[PDB]
Symmetry: C2
Subunit: 114 residues, 2 copies
Amino acid sequence: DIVMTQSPDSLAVSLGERATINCKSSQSVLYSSNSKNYLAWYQQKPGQPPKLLIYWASTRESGVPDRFSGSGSGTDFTLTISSLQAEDVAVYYCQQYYSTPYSFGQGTKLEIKR
Amino acid sequence: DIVMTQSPDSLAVSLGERATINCKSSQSVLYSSNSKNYLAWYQQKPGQPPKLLIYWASTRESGVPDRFSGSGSGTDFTLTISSLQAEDVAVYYCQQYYSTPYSFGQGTKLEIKR
C-alpha cells in the first residue's frame, strides 16, 4: 500500500516569507496509462474540513491563490507557498489517491514565526 | 461539482449506544461502468490525519472494527457505529472521490454524552 512521509512536521516562518513542504510516496503514484500523478494537497484549518488545493500534483483548484504551486513526479513532491499570508496558516496534507487506503501524509503545521 | 451535506453536525450519545451519520451528495456518485459508489468515510481525531474507514460506500478498511458499517447508493449514504466505544469519539467525514474537487462533507462531531 502506498504510504506518505512529509517533511517537515511543523514550520514557523515570517510573514511574506517563502515556505515549502515535501511529500515522498513509498511508491510511485504516477499513472502510466495516464501520465498524471495521483497526488493532491489539502489545507486544513481548525475546526473545518480539508479543502483540495491541488490535484494531479500541480493543477491548482479554482479559487486557490496564485501563491500556491505544486510540483513533483513519481515519489517526490513539493508544495510551495511563495509568500506566507495570515490566511495561509493551517495544516497541509499530501494524499495519494492512487490505491486504497488513499493515505494522508502526517501533515505539516505552518504557523507564523513570532 | 459534487457537494456533500452531512447530518447531524454534532452528536453526543451514550457509551455502547448506536450512532448513525447521514451523507447526501448533491449529485450521484455511482459509477455506471463500475456500479461502485465513489464514497468514502473518514474518521479524524484531534491533531492527527484523516484515516480511511470505508471506501466504495460499504467496504471496510483492513483493521477497522466490525462495529463500523457503511451503506447507501446514489446520493444517500449512512455510517452506523453499532456500539459507540471510547476509541470512536472523533469527527467523521464523508467525501465523494467521483470528480474534482473531491469534496469532504462538513463533518460530524461524535462525543460521549455526559
